[PDB]
């Protein structure tokens, strides 16, 4: 069941979608990037290992470019002002079955579903109030 | 209106859905828990802070329990056999607009969407290859 | 093309086969793991290195679990009652051609072919008699 | 009945097979040797012992020669230019049944089956890629 | 689709072409080798890393052997009389777009094109004058 | 056989080609540049020497400007953000003949030929996957 394929990272209704495609598999770490320069591209990485005696840990990183007032192909500095970073670590005990892992995935999807407090706060440049 | 509202963490189609409701805002950490004992409850937390002069960081955590009944000293108690922990750290520059933040949210949603490589690998107890 | 793919480790006809899938490639050690619970999963690893100026060395390991349920204090977990461990080391001089390597592989396959003394002894809980 | 018999180590169709024959059983180590010159012969050994109170351990070794003629000072001798060495150790708990042992054997056979990653890598003078 | 595929390193017009095929990806270094013994094989390696915060560096290496047969202790072995080593280091800023990288590739191709000064000098065992 | 002449570094089908012409021969090091400012020009350098007792080494350097969003004739800073560097060293044993050197040149051309993994990865801002 090979799964290292391109996918739509940002869905805009079919027109203007952001697709990321495989770009590196060194050290077993899967990497996707969009069709941009490295400084302006969307980037996704994922790897999994045995973190402890009874846990496995998925390490997932996503980089998102700032698009407002962007100059496509230009040199934008400082780097920290134009990019957002997501560092996500999912720790799963070795006892969890496929059904348990499906439940965990559903939990993450519900956490980030549109209209829910966490995505609403992030999208509104706000905290919890 | 306040964004600190209850939401469906795990959507099973209307029956058996896991709902978490606001439970604490002490020390600046927003907390949600399911309607269970603290030993067996689902948990969601979220906080935001000025990580540096020009960046803001969201810290989001979710706990998924595997419930069980444990006999301790001849008495049965509701416990969790194990818990799966999700830890998310999201750093956003202060220069990001609302549209940029919406792009970040859509990126995360597309990352965790059903059928995509990372959720498929997590549900299948496997890495990316 | 790529040989870091999933393959059938145990061929139980057409139904009930044990398939292992790539999970990790850290430190140049390829690792395959079967699906469902990690505590009960099969494991295969392989790595190759230049052991001396004139020799290359393969290190191959396989773990076969006996699946069982553990119940301690009323809490049930999926575990391996015990595991069987295979450790293989194969040394091949740099002078060996592809034909020589194919001959070595055929030698190993004939070593483990059904009806031969060593697989018969292993399958019968017996030694050489 | 007896498993200390001659068997085909390398199956080159029907003509040119490499057969090894019993030669020695000293110190509980069974040894097979192919015919013609000992300096150029194939070698297979196998022994089993109680490694711990709960484990039995098989030690299996195979030597594959590269046949050549050595000429020193005008005197010609049949020698092995070099040898490939396989060392296998398999540990099986005393609790394993005959069915469990057959499963272990099938696991090894599937490990070395043609088209699988590890035999392909060995036969192609290659690692995992 | 994966870009880790075999390719013709030396094009002789269809007969006698030197082909290298993927052979290893351990430790993040992609390796290609020709269908020969390791002692006499052609070799290509390639790796990429974040050399600094704003630059990426490709490290590309090629080995061209001059094959021979050496008598060692009265036994003839396949060796390389000598090897020619090519070492390429290519540093690219993260701000470079795909078109910029295509310009880099075209520059290298034009640099090594038949009839040009540098390849003519290399083929003629001479410098530039 | 004088060979220090201008050549097409980047071929764009005859229109828009990038030509580099001789610009310096100090210290015996041949240098080519395009018709630009030194900060924005293509630059090629080449020299050869006896590197060791049994090896000669060609040292070849190429500088490529970032063209996307370029301001022709402008002051672009930092320098490291607008230029890519190739450092290529070819080591050839003193025993190699003209035919061997032609083979080495063919190897380099095949390495960098369009459609092959290394140029594809470089042009796609990607590694090996």
Residue numbers in the entry:
A (entry chain B), B (entry chain A), C (entry chain C), D (entry chain C), E (entry chain A), F (entry chain B): 1 to 129
Verbatim from the authors:
To prevent this, we describe a method to encapsulate target proteins within highly hydrophilic, structurally homogeneous, and stable protein shells, which we refer to as “nanocrates” for this purpose. Our approach was inspired by the established use of natural virus capsids and engineered protein containers for packaging applications. We adapted this concept for cryo-EM by encapsulating target proteins within symmetric MS2 bacteriophage-derived “nanocrates”. Being highly symmetric, the nanocrates do not adopt a preferred orientation at the AWI, and therefore their enveloped cargoes are randomly oriented. Nanocrate densities can be computationally subtracted during single-particle cryo-EM analysis to allow for high-resolution reconstruction of the molecules inside.
Briefly, we purified MS2 capsids from *E. coli*, performed disassembly in an acidic solvent with the removal of packaged viral RNA by centrifugation, and reassembled the capsid proteins at neutral pH in the presence of ApoF. We designate the reassembled cages as nanocrates (“nc”) to distinguish particles derived from disassembly and reassembly, rather than another commonly used packing strategy in which cargo-containing virus-like particles (VLPs) are derived from simultaneous expression and packaging in the expression host. The @ symbol is used to designate the packaged species. Cryo-EM image analysis of MS2nc@ApoF reassembly showed a mixed population of empty and cargo-filled MS2nc particles (**[Fig fig1]**). From 5,000 micrographs, we selected ∼240,000 particles and used icosahedral symmetry to produce a map of MS2nc at a resolution of 1.86 Å. From a methodological perspective, we found that one could not simply use the published structure of MS2 for the nanocrate density subtraction step. Instead, it was necessary to employ the experimental data for MS2nc obtained for each sample to calculate the shell density for subtraction. The nanocrate thereby provides a built-in resolution standard, determining the principal resolution limit of the dataset. It can also be used to tune dataset processing parameters such as coma, magnification anisotropy, per-particle CTF, Cs value, and pixel size.
